[PDB]
Amino acid sequence: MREIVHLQAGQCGNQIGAKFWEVISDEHGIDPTGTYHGDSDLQLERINVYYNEATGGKYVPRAVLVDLEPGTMDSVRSGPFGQIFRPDNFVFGQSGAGNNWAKGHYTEGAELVDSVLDVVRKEAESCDCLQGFQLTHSLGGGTGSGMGTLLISKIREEYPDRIMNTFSVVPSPKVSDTVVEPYNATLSVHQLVENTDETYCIDNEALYDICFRTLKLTTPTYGDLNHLVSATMSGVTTCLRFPGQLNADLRKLAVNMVPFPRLHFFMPGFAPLTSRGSQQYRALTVPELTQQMFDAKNMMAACDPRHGRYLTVAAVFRGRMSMKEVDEQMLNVQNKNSSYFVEWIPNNVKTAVCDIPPRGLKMSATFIGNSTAIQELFKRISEQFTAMFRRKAFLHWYTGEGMDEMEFTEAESNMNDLVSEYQQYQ
Amino acid sequence: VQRKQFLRLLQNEQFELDMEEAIQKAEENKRLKELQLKQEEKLAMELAK
Amino acid sequence: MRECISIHVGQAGVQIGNACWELYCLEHGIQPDGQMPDDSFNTFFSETGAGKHVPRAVFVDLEPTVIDEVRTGTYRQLFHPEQLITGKEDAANNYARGHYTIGKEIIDLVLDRIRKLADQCTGLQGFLVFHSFGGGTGSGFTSLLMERLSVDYGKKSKLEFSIYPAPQVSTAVVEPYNSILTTHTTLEHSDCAFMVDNEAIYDICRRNLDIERPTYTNLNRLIGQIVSSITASLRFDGALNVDLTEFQTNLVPYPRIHFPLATYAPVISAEKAYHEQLSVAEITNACFEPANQMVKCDPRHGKYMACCLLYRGDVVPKDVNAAIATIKTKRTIQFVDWCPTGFKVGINYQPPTVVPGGDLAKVQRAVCMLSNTTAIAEAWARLDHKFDLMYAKRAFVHWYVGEGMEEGEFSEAREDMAALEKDYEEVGVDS
Amino acid sequence: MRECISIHVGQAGVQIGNACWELYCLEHGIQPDGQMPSDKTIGGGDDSFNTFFSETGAGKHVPRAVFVDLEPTVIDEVRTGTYRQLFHPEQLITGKEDAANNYARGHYTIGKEIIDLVLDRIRKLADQCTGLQGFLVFHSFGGGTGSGFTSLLMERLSVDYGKKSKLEFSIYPAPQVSTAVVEPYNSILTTHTTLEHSDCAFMVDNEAIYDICRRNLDIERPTYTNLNRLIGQIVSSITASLRFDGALNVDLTEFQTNLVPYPRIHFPLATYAPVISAEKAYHEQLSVAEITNACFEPANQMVKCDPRHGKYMACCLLYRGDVVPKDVNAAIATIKTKRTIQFVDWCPTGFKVGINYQPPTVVPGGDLAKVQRAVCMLSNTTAIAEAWARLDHKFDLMYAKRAFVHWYVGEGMEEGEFSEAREDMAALEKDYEEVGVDS
Amino acid sequence: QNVYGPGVRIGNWNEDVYLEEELMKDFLEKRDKGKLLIQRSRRLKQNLLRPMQLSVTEDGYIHYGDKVMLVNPDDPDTEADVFLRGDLSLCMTPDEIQSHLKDELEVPCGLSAVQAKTPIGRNTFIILSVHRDATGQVLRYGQDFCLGITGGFDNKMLYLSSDHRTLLKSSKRSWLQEVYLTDEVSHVNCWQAAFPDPQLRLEYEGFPVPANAKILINHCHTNRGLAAHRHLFLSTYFGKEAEVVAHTYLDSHRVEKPRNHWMLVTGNPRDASSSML
Ligand SMILES: Nc1nc2c(ncn2[C@@H]2O[C@H](COP(=O)(O)OP(=O)(O)OP(=O)(O)O)[C@@H](O)[C@H]2O)c(=O)[nH]1
Ligand SMILES: Nc1nc2c(ncn2[C@@H]2O[C@H](COP(=O)(O)OP(=O)(O)OP(=O)(O)O)[C@@H](O)[C@H]2O)c(=O)[nH]1
Ligand SMILES: Nc1nc2c(ncn2[C@@H]2O[C@H](COP(=O)(O)OP(=O)(O)O)[C@@H](O)[C@H]2O)c(=O)[nH]1
Ligand SMILES: [Mg+2]
Ligand SMILES: [Mg+2]
């Protein structure tokens, strides 16, 4: 009944998304071939959300894979679940973006997107009742930030009333992998505030610390962090595909958590995270999950919640739970932390409980957060912008491509409007 | 006409046989899945003990 | 010729109806198939062709998640396939999404069923609409449904059962906005609306039934018994029976004060019932104690205004009379002076029936109290105070004005609950 | 019982007839030895092969077709190929010294010598026909035999058999790429004769199939074997009603009735969809709407003419396989509300629909994929006058300097019909304009 | 739009669920009551193709009451390009459509020739005397005998029969005299065995007939020989069968053709399920 269109752009976006289809195809009992093999009748109840049926009752995912270089396009195709996507949906160029935002938004991004917008026009017009969009990319690149934010704006000019949900990996100080990171992050979020209803900020610093302290993994591979991200994507939208006591779709999550049109940046989380050694010592209860949810070490962004205030918090639970335990636990945590939450909004917390827990586990709780502390992740990018813009360093690759110097002064002013807007209510 | 009527009757018989096979296969699948789950649980119990 | 039409709107209204219609099948002996292996079922069921007993409820929701749970559940063979009406997308806890944009695309199918259902009934007694205040569908969609019903059916009674927002515990965030927006239209097209909440039933299950972990599947059984106690005077025989019209006269003194409280007694577990003694002189004192009111409010600050007690089961009318005069001489139970007679009692012959596998005990006699009082001015004071601290900074407003409903409706609905607030002191001041 | 006699003349007709007659043997399960396999004891009730395959007392099935050429270069490969035992020893007719892309050699000098031998073999094939629907012709405009020998074969066929249907599948010259130099002379002359001696002329060219095999089947380097199969798939969808069963069948007179409004306009356009590779069918859903939406796109046309310049007159939809008549009406109703597709004013109902139950059968190891439903559209369009325009532009630009004329005068053909054949289609171009005038 | 199918809860799925539940309930009710076509065909095939044991002779003379199998031997004929090869056995054939629609066998039932070698319930014939009460008797040349087939049924006995040609009575495909099976007892069930060579036929008349030998089977009232048409094919529920008629075939030397030669086959003493072949 409700449909979600997926789009994968950038090297970081394709690998997370290809790991994201691993989780839900196991949830719905789909083989890499495309044939349903499950046990319960609640899995084929809602398969039209993410999947299309083909000849022979064989299932294909509703995702579009877009890139400019075939280096990571053939890596996903030669993966575990690579033989399930549509071969026509693999849209790619030949020339790489060079980690340059001008190559992905004016020079090579303006040629390919005409073919890119045709396939997402095919999938949207054949849907029954389209609910929204979904896109995975990164803010620090040239491909994932060039056409990552270009596909957002063009769809907004076509479909005005939907919910456009994106998952962006944000830059970090200590895990800097590119010299030109502060330039590409500012140039991308300028359009993300304008034309996106909800944006999830995920930081590589917090993903490594979860893998180090809570999970106790000494050598985390990039296949490990993408499983941490893919848990929170499937948890926030589980009320559209599975029955539960409190159903809340994506638009219901939009009304509760967005008080003002320019404050829609979220921190995500996954509750039952435990190490290999200490699975036996822990006891799985609803108050145990709530203590794990409100831990500072569990969120996916390197922002300290103790240096800010919370606007709106929600938590989507999964499994068979009593409802007094869920309701009284999100009242105790609000009364025991009264100064930390805002005083002009009563009842910051939000409840969501689903009947079906994930595979191999008894309960789950997906965490989402809005806080004033997200400005610290935005001041560090904005301060790194100033130290590189005053000397006009690395500008001749941007300015020599068709870009003026007046877009950089425009975008930096938009951060300081956004940083002050969180500080205004704190 | 005569052999066409013969084909129609044989097709009806094939329809009945197809329905019987379609109702048998689900029972076989359920039995196999239940046996596999029970054996896995018993093995886990023994090794833990 | 005594018929009642039930409408179940929203998730909270429908999910109670999953447990409401479970209880009605046990009362009359009807199987979940719809077959009965004499005519007291005719209030709630219409026997149809082939002897199937068809209910008299319309299940409407803008979302297909919850109705498809019933269309695949154990009660598939009971309801009509055209009385289960769905949409495509929910209201997303937005008043202007269930009333202004999406609520208009299904409202013609909703009223077509009520018109078809009412023609089969010989004498129509009233309406029993179930929803909750906080959600968008339980606010937006019930607002125009009773708006179009009051112009089509004029003088028919409209009995309302709604989930009032609890003071400290709540689910959503925009519920102070949606509670004010619901009640603008209720004061003009509703005749008697009963409030219940979620925090009072939690404390009853903790202390009285001794349940450590209550669930929404447990609260719906308790609400399912109160609605089956109000409508018990029509299905069965009694010493003196109360019709739907005649407890609307003696509970509504003024056109703006029609918000009574629902109270059931005795609500006891299995392990405690066989020890302590259940007399009529004790089960009526359990209705007046401050712990057993099913709305989070203190009755001792306000004063009682109109009380109605509906006894069912093995009850002699003598000890009811001695119990009333026992109440009237107690100084802590304060009545208003302008209403010297305030107690309306009603005796029925049918004891309650326990659902197998349930949490309630098998009890020989029970009383349901419907009390009109001035104590709920405190309940409407705290919710108005939560509205002002959010409308000052214009939070959560652009989701409303983006659908078609202008910002001028917030100030008009605020001044109406402002207007009915002083109507409680205008009737609470002694003459 | 209803039987067709196919005629293949030229080098195009034989090479199409090699791939077309492979499909009939591979659809009815007729082996190259000429016999059905013996593993059919359960099977029965099949006599639909009698349209093309004639039984014998030994159980051998031989085709009802004639293969005509003026050289032994192309038919000797058939006679020493896989299907040497299947065709008749006399139904493969050979000449000498070909025609060398000259119309006069094909019509007056060499094509007069063997016309009596072929006319005996047609009559020897027509007495066995207890019921004959008509003739099907495969030839080429740009050749010497395909344009010269055809021009008098249609004149002798109409005299012997009066009002029998004649339907053509012709290889029109492509607008940009081609092979022969003097192709405007041969293309002008043979279609001046056959305006009044034909009834319906399905056309297809060679460039527009090169475009199809590139962006649909992802074949970078096709040959004529890849092109002949797609032409061989059109013929099966046209004729499938006479062979197999269906909810609505069309005879060779039924879709001749519903595609020619006037006697001088008998030129449809041939299209086919869905065409796709083996891998890409495994994922894409093939709805009844999506196979009829592909036929109306100009990129899927098999003749290099854009239908947006002109207006459709009549159309014929021929369905196969698991087609329900419900989805045919809903997909047609969408097309009726499209503004891009334009119709003339005097044909309010332009669609003729036929359904056959047999799904399309695909050769093993072929480039095209096995599908359950397919549609072939025989659409009449005014925009074929664009195709005549570029060729008559080519004709007088070369006729002005009297180039290559002595190849035609010195063989037996007068120069007087060089001007008359140009003056014939000058008036035919006036006829396509008057038909398209809205009343 | 797009379509998904049975399980998915999208669009108009409720009426499809009702329709498939109704169809499944009807199918289970029919198959539990036993009105299923495949079950009836299974019972009919089990009755027809049952194994049977033949008789075993000692002195080579065919006895009355013995169970034999009628087999036409194979000859390299040059009459037609396509015809049945190998030895054929005379098997009865009920009507196909009436056999599918009704359980009971419909007399009369036609006959045919099938490529079969193992004796089954469809091709075992018992040689009987019209005088009856025959014990320890030898079948002789030129003497009347009758053939009776139980046919895989323990209920009834059926006999070969034929009559003079009529404009309403003819064979199925060859338009000659027909041979069928009836339960009636008359003179049209009697057959005679004669020597193939015309010169020694009257000399060998009145001699005990050898077993597993080529003999001619001649009807009494019409005087036609039992003949097997190899080149004319009959479609049957059990495949393709050669035709059988009553006609006498003569070459240019007035010698009986290999169509009319028939051989009576007994059972192998070492393995009673197998024959002498
Ligand atoms: N007692 C009880 N209350 C419920 C139940 N389900 C929902 N509620 C209450 O309903 C309130 C809000 O309504 P929702 O749950 O959002 O359902 P709704 O009114 O249809 O709103 P939407 O689902 O967004 O359309 C919550 O605060 C709950 O307290 C239930 O099963 N039992
Ligand atoms: N598409 C396609 N075209 C063919 C094929 N065979 C021949 N042609 C066409 O035939 C034209 C050349 O004439 P031919 O058919 O080879 O020779 P002809 O028609 O017999 O004329 P003559 O050689 O003078 O006797 C070429 O332009 C081709 O377009 C074929 O198999 N497929
Ligand atoms: N989680 C995760 N992050 C990645 C992976 N590969 C790259 N990244 C992050 O992506 C950032 C650079 O973005 P980049 O890949 O250059 O963007 P692109 O050029 O548009 O594809 C780095 O800071 C990395 O932390 C991966 O496999 N997993
Ligand atoms: Mg809901
Ligand atoms: Mg040639």
Rounded to whole angstroms, the Cα distance separating C264 from D125 reads 98
Helix (H, G, I), strand (E, B) or coil at A175: coil
Confirm if D73 and D14 have CB atoms less than 8 A apart.
no
CATH C-level class of C261-375: alpha beta
Architecture of domain C376-430 in this structure: Orthogonal Bundle (1.10)
Rounded to whole angstroms, the Cα distance separating C283 from C56 reads 33
- CA of C135 relative to ligand 1 center, distance in Å: 6
Q: Which sign does the torsion angle of CA D396, D401, D402, D407 carry?
A: negative
Tokens of C119: 């023609």
Helix (H, G, I), strand (E, B) or coil at E215: strand
Superfamily of domain A375-425: Helix hairpin bin (1.10.287.600)
Residue E241 CB-half CA count within 13 A: 23
Report CB contact under 8 Å: E36, B5. no
CATH number for domain D269-383, candidates 3.30.1330.20, 3.40.1190.20, 3.40.50.1000, 3.40.50.2300: 3.30.1330.20
Eight-state DSSP code of residue E216? E
DSSP string computed for B27-43: HHHHHHHHHHHHHHHHH
Q: Are strands D92-93 and D65-68 parallel, antiparallel or unpaired?
A: parallel
The whole-angstrom distance between E18's CA and the closest CA on chain D is 21
Residue type, B38: K
Helix (H) or strand (E) holding A307: none
Confirm if C3 and C110 have CB atoms less than 8 A apart.
no
**What residue segments make up the domains of chain D, in order of their start?**
2-268, 269-383, 384-438
D57 closest CB neighbour out of E3, E80, E239: E80
Compute the CA torsion angle C353, C356, C359, C361 (nearest 10 deg): 40
Nearest ligand atom owner, CA of C200: 1
Question: For atom 19 of ligand 2, which residue has the closest CA?
Answer: D143
Q: Considering only CA atoms, give the Rg of chain A.
A: 21
- Judged by 3 or more CB pairs under 8 A, whether C touches B is no
Edge-to-edge order in the sheet of strand C343-347:
C84-85, C57-60, C3-9, C124-132, C157-163, C192-196, C261-265, C365-373, C304-313, C343-347
Rounded to whole angstroms, the Cα distance separating E242 from E93 reads 11
Cis peptide before D274 (omega within 30 of 0): yes
Q: Considering only CA atoms, give the Rg of chain C.
A: 21
Rounded to whole angstroms, the Cα distance separating C158 from C127 reads 5
- Cβ neighbours of residue A424 closer than 8 Å, sequence gap 6 or more: none
Eight-state DSSP code of residue C352? P
Conformation bin of residue C223: beta by default, left when phi > 0, alpha when psi is -120 to 50: alpha
Residues making up chain A, counted from first to last: 426
CATH C-level class of D2-268: alpha beta
- CA of A147 relative to ligand 3 center, distance in Å: 15
Q: Are strands A364-371 and D200-204 parallel, antiparallel or unpaired?
A: unpaired
CATH number for domain D384-438, candidates 1.10.760.10, 3.90.45.10, 3.30.1490.100, 1.10.287.600: 1.10.287.600
Rounded to whole angstroms, the Cα distance separating D245 from D46 reads 11
Q: Which sign does the torsion angle of CA E210, E213, E215, E220 carry?
A: positive
* Nearest alpha carbon to residue C375 among C259, C245, C201, C279: C259
Q: How far is CA E132 from the centre of its chain?
A: 24
Q: How many CB atoms lie within 10 A of CB E83?
A: 13
The catalytic residue among C147, C199, C246, C403 is C246
Dihedral pair phi/psi, residue E235, rounded to 5° = -80, 140
Confirm if D378 and D269 have CB atoms less than 8 A apart.
yes
Q: Please indicate if any CB of chain A lies within 8 Å of the CB of C187.
A: no
Cβ–ligand 1 contact at C169 (below 6 Å): no
Q: How far is CA A267 from CA A148, A203, A299, in A?
A: 20, 10, 6
Eight-state DSSP code of residue A32? S
Residue appearing with tokens 């109507």: C423
**What residue segments make up the domains of chain A, in order of their start?**
3-257, 265-374, 375-425
Q: Which sign does the torsion angle of CA C354, C356, C360, C361 carry?
A: positive
User: D42 contacts in B (CB within 8 Å)?
Assistant: 10
Q: How many CB atoms lie within 10 A of CB B8?
A: 11
Q: How far is CA D194 from CA C42, C334, D148, D212, D430, in A?
A: 84, 112, 11, 29, 18
In CATH, the number for domain A265-374 is 3.30.1330.20
Rounded to whole angstroms, the Cα distance separating B1 from B24 reads 35
Cβ–ligand 1 contact at C263 (below 6 Å): no
Cis peptide before D325 (omega within 30 of 0): no
Residue type, C398: H
Q: How many CB atoms lie within 10 A of CB E108?
A: 17
- CA of D74 relative to ligand 4 center, distance in Å: 74
How would you label A391-415 residue by residue, b for 16+ Cβ within 10 Å and e otherwise?
eeeeeebbeeeebeeeebeebbebb
Q: Nearest residue on chain E to A3, judged by CA atoms?
A: E10
Rounded to whole angstroms, the Cα distance separating A104 from A93 reads 11
Dihedral pair phi/psi, residue D65, rounded to 5° = -145, 155
User: C68 contacts in E (CB within 8 Å)?
Assistant: 9
Question: For atom 5 of ligand 3, which residue has the closest CA?
Answer: A12
Instruction: Give the angle subtended at the CA of A290 by the CAs of C170 and A300, to the nearest 5°.
Output: 110
Which chains would you list as touching C if contact means 3+ CB atom pairs under 8 Å?
A, E
Q: Which sign does the torsion angle of CA E181, E184, E187, E191 carry?
A: positive
CATH C-level class of C2-260: alpha beta
**Three-state secondary structure of E104-158:** CCCCCEEEEEECCCCCECCCCEEEECCCCCCCCCECECCCCEEEEECCCCCCCCE
Tokens of A156: 């907004």
**Three-state secondary structure of chain D:** CCEEEEEEEHHHHHHHHHHHHHHHHHHCCCCCCCCCCCCCCCCCCCCHHHHCEECCCCCCCEECEEEECCCCCCHHHHHCCCCCCCCCCCCEECCCCCCCCCHHHHHHHCCCCCHHHHHHHHHHHHCCCCCEEEEEEEEECCCCHHHHHHHHHHHHHHHHCCCCEEEEEEECCCCCCCCCCCHHHHHHHHHHHCCCCCCEEEEECCHHHHHHHHHCCCCCCCCHHHHHHHHHHHHHHHHHHHHCCCCECCCCCHHHHCCCCCCCCCCEEEEEECCCCHHHHCCCCCCHHHHHHCCCCHHHECCCCCCCCCCECCEEEEEEECCCHHHHHHHHHHHHCCCCCCECCCCCCCEEEEEECCCCCCCCCCCCCCCCEEEEEEEEEHHHHHHHHHHHHHHHHHHCCCCCCHHHHCCCCCCHHHHHHHHHHHHHHHHHHHHCCCC
Helix (H, G, I), strand (E, B) or coil at B7: helix
D contact residues 29-48, partner B, Cβ 8 Å cutoff? 42, 44-45
Q: At what angle do helices A181-194 and A375-389 cross, to 10 degrees?
A: 130
Where would I find the beta strands (DSSP E) of chain E?
67-72, 88-93, 109-114, 125-128, 145-149, 158-161, 180-182, 190-194, 214-219, 226-236, 239-246, 261-265
Where would I find the beta strands (DSSP E) of C146-236?
157-163, 192-196
Tokens of C136: 């968008």
User: D285 contacts in E (CB within 8 Å)?
Assistant: 2
Eight-state DSSP code of residue A336? S
Tokens of A373: 């502390």
Q: Nearest residue on chain E to A241, judged by CA atoms?
A: E9
Residue type, A154: K
Rounded to whole angstroms, the Cα distance separating D26 from E248 reads 44
Looking at ligand 3, which atom is closest to the CA of residue A207?
Answer: 1
Residue type, D203: M
Q: Which of D140, D150, D203, D226 to mutate to test the pocket of ligand 2 (most atoms within 8 A of CB)?
A: D140
Rounded to whole angstroms, the Cα distance separating D275 from D279 reads 12
Strand partners, A368: A268, A314
Q: How far is CA A190 from the centre of its chain?
A: 18
Confirm if D231 and D192 have CB atoms less than 8 A apart.
no
Helix (H) or strand (E) holding A62: none
Residue type, A296: A
Cβ–ligand 2 contact at D171 (below 6 Å): yes
Rounded to whole angstroms, the Cα distance separating A318 from A301 reads 23
Helix (H, G, I), strand (E, B) or coil at B5: helix
Q: How many CB atoms lie within 10 A of CB A292?
A: 20
Rounded to whole angstroms, the Cα distance separating D22 from D30 reads 10
Rounded to whole angstroms, the Cα distance separating A373 from C184 reads 39
CATH C-level class of A3-257: alpha beta
- Cβ neighbours of residue D402 closer than 8 Å, sequence gap 6 or more: none
Strand partners, E93: E110
Dihedral pair phi/psi, residue C127, rounded to 5° = -120, 145
Q: How many CB atoms lie within 10 A of CB C302?
A: 18
